[PDB]
């Protein structure tokens, strides 16, 4: 019920929401492994596959983490999160050229700031919307900062309860910018059984002004396609130009072929989803005309004999004077003439 | 909400319902073009692709239609419905051998009776459940007959309003047999835009004891996969051993490859669908440990100085004494010692 709404906002010229074509965000993320060259190759692959939006991650490691980060290992790598972010991070000059390049290909560039300095770098660049990752969903100070920039926010909600998300959404509303909530599970990769697509409806019922989507880290497109069937408006998967690239997120990334598959499925499900059972489909009319049943004589019935459940039955097609709906209303009427076995009962056959 | 239920029943040894693996019904239908040989080839192809259930149509043309049927043409052929059914119908001997053959391959055989004589033929054969097609959804006399057989009913609901379906469901309940409702659109093939998957939820809210599914006549699997994401339990598509066969339903039929695709997608979506947003996923724990932020000093703070929003900030990872959740609670506390810029605030750092 709640995901079928008219909520919408714009990311540059692209309208997003239930009544619009679903938007697939290609998250290049840290997939370029810190090489501007590789990022360009991945942008090209995304452009050529028909992508509309390319999303980056903005890492300024010194403002993003304290020295404790050098001693903690993520679940999908074997060195510290600090080492990974330091190796992968693009400096400001390079991130500016990356945005310029994505925009040169007619695509929208957005990014996820992981820190205050990251957020301020992106505001200087003037990006059209901000993604907040699940890690920062409960980082209320960072959300305050980002919301003050006056751009729409796409908030990922993994690792956070409805009540925790509420505090983030209050800050966003107070700032007066529109937002989307992406349901998300941050296990790299995500087992099918942990996706819980019903979480999207949980989010929509709690936050009726939110545009709703899915960010996904499973091995394929099924989860995202399911999210589109349920009403999702934004789909996010990591993206790579090819699956033999190194990096911790490559495994759950889409490539050009699987992007195109998702785009086509998303289009199909956008059209198929929603609507109402009772809507009359013009195209069904011919089928109804032959497939519905009319009342027929099940026996020779003499003039003056009573019609009954023993001498009446129903058969296709639907053009007889009495529809199967009216079968029992004929019980006890009297034959106005001889009625031939197998003939449709006519209005002139009854007194 | 309503499709997530514990409703179930058995078709022979196969349990069907939201809490069970979705069931794909391979409708051979009239695809054999009246040849027992061809039907066997299609059964073999279904068995080898991993099908669980093969569904037939039982046509006894004389009890199914009056002479008017020889003058009406369906929307996906160019001769009368009578001519098509007469050419395609298997006689009783052949239908008995077809059931025997499907059961010899360890599969379940069910059928759709299109008439009273068809229904009685199938009762003599002792099929384990009955499908009622959309045409007969409102054929209340036929539904009464079929329900009296004491087997579960799978009812297709195309071309019929919730109110019309109600009358059919009342008859089924009175008979005391369990049932499923399949949402359906009878246009061959169905445009994506006419599918209206939300009709499944309309059916579940109106009929809370019903097992719910989709019968589909689109050109591919997207609709069915969407139905599984929403909670659907039974999927029905026409089936052929190959796509170069003649016949009016071949166009929208699945073949062995597309059956297997649907089976795998259905399995994936069965696992992914439903659930709750607030459920704590054990597998997310490592990510939370590195991705959440702790309060840090944003400046050198001398012993005795007050903590504030100017000399405090937040940074990854999440192992500090104060979580980002507690950031503002530190405002106005007094430094118990020199606090180093960038260090996590500890409990021993405050008076
Ligand atoms: Mn991600
Ligand atoms: Mn059909």
CA distance A62 to A52: 32
CA distance A230 to A221: 14
Report yes or no: A265 and A227 within 8 Å, Cβ to Cβ: no
Which ligand has its closest atom nearest to the C-alpha of A214?
A: 1
Size of interface A-B (CB pairs under 8 A): 307
**DSSP label at residue A134:** G
User: Is B8-278 a CATH 3.20.20.70 domain?
Assistant: yes
CA distance B12 to B230: 26
Using the Cβ of A329 and the Cβ atoms of chain B, whether some distance falls under 8 Å is answered with no
Report yes or no: B326 and B295 within 8 Å, Cβ to Cβ: yes
Rounded to the nearest whole angstrom, what is the distance from the C-alpha of residue B239 to the centroid of ligand 2?
10
- Quote the tokens at residue B126: 């002792």
- Quote the tokens at residue A51: 């992508």
**Residues in a beta bridge with B26:** B54, B237
Report yes or no: A116 and B296 within 8 Å, Cβ to Cβ: no
Rounded to the nearest whole angstrom, what is the distance from the C-alpha of residue B186 to the centroid of ligand 2?
7
A98 to chain B, closest Cα gap in Å? 25
Instruction: For CATH 3.90.1210.10, list the domain ranges present in chain B.
Output: 279-351
Looking at chain A from residue 36 to 55, which residues have their Cβ under 8 Å from any Cβ of chain B? Answer: none
Using the Cβ of A189 and the Cβ atoms of chain B, whether some distance falls under 8 Å is answered with no
Decide if A342 and B66 are in contact by the 8 Å CB cutoff: yes
Tell me how many degrees the CA angle B314-B318-B322 measures, rounded to the nearest 5.
Answer: 60
Rounded to the nearest whole angstrom, what is the distance from the C-alpha of residue B216 to the centroid of ligand 2?
7
Rounded to the nearest whole angstrom, what is the distance from the C-alpha of residue B345 to the centroid of ligand 1?
29
Decide if A64 and B315 are in contact by the 8 Å CB cutoff: yes
B136 to chain A, closest Cα gap in Å? 7
Buried b (16+ CB within 10 A) or exposed e, A293-317: bbbbbbeebeeeeebeeebbbbbbb
Whole-Å CA distances, B103 to B21, B22, B97, B349: 21, 20, 10, 76
β-pair type (A130-132, A153-156): parallel
Whole-Å CA distances, B34 to A106, A134, B90: 56, 58, 6
Which residues on B lie below 8 Å from A281 (Cβ)?
185, 187, 194
A80, A230, A281, A294: which to substitute to probe chain B, counting the most B Cβ within 10 Å? A281
Instruction: For CATH 3.20.20.70, list the domain ranges present in chain B.
Output: 8-278
B16 to chain A, closest Cα gap in Å? 19
Using the Cβ of B232 and the Cβ atoms of chain A, whether some distance falls under 8 Å is answered with no
Method: X-ray
Sign of the C-alpha dihedral, residues B318, A60, A84, A195?
Answer: positive
Which residues on B lie below 8 Å from A188 (Cβ)?
287
Using the Cβ of B135 and the Cβ atoms of chain A, whether some distance falls under 8 Å is answered with yes
- Placement of tokens 């290909």 in the chain: A105
Report yes or no: B25 and A25 within 8 Å, Cβ to Cβ: no
Q: Helix/strand/coil (H, E, C) string of chain B?
A: CCCCCCCEEEECCEEEECCCCCEEEEEEECCCCCCHHHHHHHHHHHHHCCCCEEEEEECCHHHHECHHHHHCCCCCCCCCHHHHHHHHCCCHHHHHHHHHHHHHCCCEEEEEECCHHHHHHHHHHCCCCEEECHHHCCCHHHHHHHHCCCCCEEEECCCCCHHHHHHHHHHHHHHCCCEEEEECCCCCCCCHHHCCCCHHHHHHHHCCCCEEEEECCCCCCHHHHHHHHHCCCEEEEEECCCCCCCCCCHHHCECHHHHHHHHHHHHHHHHHCCCCCCCCCHHHHHHHHHHCCEEEECCCECCCCECCCCCEEEEECCCCCCEHHHHHHHCCCEECCCECCCCECCHHHEC
CATH class of B279-351: alpha beta
B73, B141, B186 member nearest A327 (Cβ):
B141
Residues 6+ positions from B329 with CB-CB distance below 8 Å: B322
Decide if B158 and A134 are in contact by the 8 Å CB cutoff: no
CA distance A201 to A199: 5
Which residues on A lie below 8 Å from B279 (Cβ)?
196
Decide if A286 and B185 are in contact by the 8 Å CB cutoff: no
Task: List phi, psi (to 5°) of B57.
Answer: -120, 135
Rounded to the nearest whole angstrom, what is the distance from the C-alpha of residue A288 to the centroid of ligand 2?
13
Using the Cβ of B113 and the Cβ atoms of chain A, whether some distance falls under 8 Å is answered with no
Using the Cβ of A187 and the Cβ atoms of chain B, whether some distance falls under 8 Å is answered with yes
A96 to chain B, closest Cα gap in Å? 24
The terminus-to-terminus CA distance of chain A in angstroms comes to 51
- Quote the tokens at residue B296: 């840090």
Q: Which residues of A are annotated as a binding site?
A: 217, 236, 238
Whole-Å CA distances, A68 to A32, A113, B318: 25, 20, 9
Resolution in Å, one decimal place: 2.2
- Closest of B315, B290, B283, B324 to residue A72, by C-alpha: B290
Report yes or no: A270 and A278 within 8 Å, Cβ to Cβ: no
Rounded to the nearest whole angstrom, what is the distance from the C-alpha of residue A218 to the centroid of ligand 1?
10
- Closest of B181, B202, B238, B179 to residue B8, by C-alpha: B179
- Quote the tokens at residue B55: 């569904």
Rg (CA), chain A: 30
**Residues in a beta bridge with A37:** none
Residues 6+ positions from A104 with CB-CB distance below 8 Å: none
Tell me how many degrees the CA angle B141-B145-B149 measures, rounded to the nearest 5.
Answer: 160
CA distance A270 to B223: 10
Burial of A348 (0-12, 13-18, 19+ CB in 10 A): exposed
Residues 6+ positions from B156 with CB-CB distance below 8 Å: B131, B132, B133, B134, B137, B182, B184, B215, B236
Nearest CA in chain A to B206: A277
Chain mean position to CA B205: 16
- Closest of B24, B48, B44 to residue B36, by C-alpha: B44
Sign of the C-alpha dihedral, residues B86, B90, B91, B92?
Answer: negative
Which residues on B lie below 8 Å from A139 (Cβ)?
292-293, 314, 324
CA distance A172 to A144: 7
Whole-Å CA distances, A310 to A313, B118, B280, B298: 8, 18, 63, 92
What is residue A120's three-state secondary structure?
helix
CA distance B351 to A250: 47
Report yes or no: A207 and A172 within 8 Å, Cβ to Cβ: no
CA distance B162 to B167: 9
Report yes or no: A82 and A53 within 8 Å, Cβ to Cβ: no
Task: List phi, psi (to 5°) of B80.
Answer: -65, 150
Residues 6+ positions from B229 with CB-CB distance below 8 Å: A197, A225, A226, A227, A229, A230, B269, B272, B273
Nearest CA in chain B to A70: B317
B53 to chain A, closest Cα gap in Å? 24
**DSSP label at residue A324:** G
Decide if B135 and A325 are in contact by the 8 Å CB cutoff: no
Report yes or no: A294 and A315 within 8 Å, Cβ to Cβ: yes
């Amino acid at each position: 019920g709640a995901m079928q709404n008219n909520n919408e906002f714009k990311i540059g010229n692209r309208s997003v929401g239930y009544n619009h074509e679903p938007l697939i965000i290609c998250e290049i993320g840290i997939n370029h492994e810190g090489s501007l060259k590789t990022a360009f190759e991945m942008v090209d692959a995304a452009y050529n596959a028909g992508a509309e939006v390319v999303k980056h991650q903005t890492h300024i490691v010194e403002d993003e983490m304290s020295d404790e980060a050098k001693q903690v290992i993520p679940g999908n790598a074997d060195v510290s999160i600090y080492e990974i972010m330091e190796r992968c991070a693009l400096n400001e000059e390079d991130e500016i050229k990356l945005k310029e390049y994505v925009e040169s290909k007619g695509m929208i560039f957005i990014s996820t700031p992981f820190s205050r300095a990251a957020a301020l770098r992106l505001q200087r660049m003037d990006i059209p919307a901000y993604k907040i990752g699940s890690g920062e969903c409960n980082n209320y100070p960072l959300i305050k900062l980002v919301a003050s920039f006056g751009k729409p926010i796409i908030l990922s909600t993994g690792m956070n309860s409805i009540e925790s998300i509420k505090k983030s959404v209050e800050i966003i509303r107070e700032a007066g910018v529109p937002y989307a909530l992406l349901h998300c599970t941050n296990i790299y990769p995500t087992p099918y059984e942990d996706v819980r697509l019903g979480g999207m409806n949980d989010l929509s019922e709690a936050f009726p002004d939110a545009i709703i989507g899915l960010s996904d880290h499973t091995l394929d497109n099924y989860a995202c396609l399911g999210a589109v069937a349920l009403g999702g408006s934004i789909l996010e998967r990591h993206f790579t130009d090819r699956m033999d690239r190194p990096g911790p997120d490559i495994v759950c990334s889409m490539n050009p072929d699987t992007f195109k598959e998702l785009k086509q499925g998303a289009h199909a499900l956008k059209l198929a989803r929603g609507g109402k059972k009772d809507t009359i489909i013009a195209g069904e009319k011919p089928t109804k005309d032959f497939a519905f049943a009319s009342v027929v004589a099940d026996k020779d019935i003499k003039k003056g004999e009573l019609l009954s459940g023993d001498n009446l039955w129903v058969k296709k097609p639907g053009n007889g004077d009495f529809s199967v709906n009216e079968y029992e209303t004929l019980f006890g009427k009297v034959a106005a003439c001889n009625i031939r076995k197998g003939a449709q009962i006519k209005k002139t056959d009854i007194e």
